[PDB]
Amino acid sequence: SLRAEELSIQVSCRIMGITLVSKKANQQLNFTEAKEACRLLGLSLAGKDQVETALKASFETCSYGWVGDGFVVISRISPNPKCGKNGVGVLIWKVPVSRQFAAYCYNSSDTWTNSCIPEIIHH
Ligand SMILES: *[C@@H]1O[C@H](CO)[C@@H](O)[C@H](O)[C@H]1NC(C)=O
Numbered sequence: 001s002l003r004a005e006e007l008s009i010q011v012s013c014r015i016m017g018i019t020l021v022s023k024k025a026n027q028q029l030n031f032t033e034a035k036e037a038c039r040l041l042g043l044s045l046a047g048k049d050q051v052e053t054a055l056k057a058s059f060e061t062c063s064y065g066w067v068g069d070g071f072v073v074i075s076r077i078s079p080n081p082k083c084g085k086n087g088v089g090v091l092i093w094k095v096p097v098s099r100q101f102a103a104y105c106y107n108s109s110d111t112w113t114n115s116c117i118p119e120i121i122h123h
C-alpha cells in the first residue's frame, strides 16, 4: 500500500488549509490514491471550492493535482505558459480517474490564513 514516506509536501505554508502532496517517485497518484495520500497525513482530498477559497488568499501552484469529485486542477494567479497554459483561476479538467497527478489536500484544523504567518491572539 501507499506509505506516507513516499510523499512530499509541495506547499509548505498552507493557504486556507490547502496543501499539495506529490509522490517522490516518478509515478504519481490516481484519483483513489490521491484520497489515500491525503488520509495518510490526516488530511482530506480538497474540494475545488476549497482550492478556490485558497486562491482568493493568493494560493498558487505549478502542478496538476486531484480534487474531490474527479477533477484535476491547478491554481493560477498570474498567466504562465508553463503552469496551466496561461490560464487564470482554479483551472479544472474532468479527467479519467486512472490518470496520475498530485493531490490537493485540505486541513480543517488550520486557523491561520497562511499556516506560516502568525495572527494576533485574541484573549
Ligand atoms: C489506482 O491505483 C490503485 C493502486 O494502489 C489501483 O488498485 C486502482 O485500480 C487504480 N484505479 C484506477 C481507476 O486505475
Ligand SMILES: *[C@@H]1O[C@H](CO)[C@@H](O)[C@H](O)[C@H]1NC(C)=O
Pocket: 041, 042, 043, 107, 108, 109, 110, 111, 112, 115
Ligand atoms: C493541520 O492544521 C493544524 C492546525 O494548524 C496543525 O496543527 C497540523 O499540523 C496540520 N496538519 C497537517 C497534516 O497539515
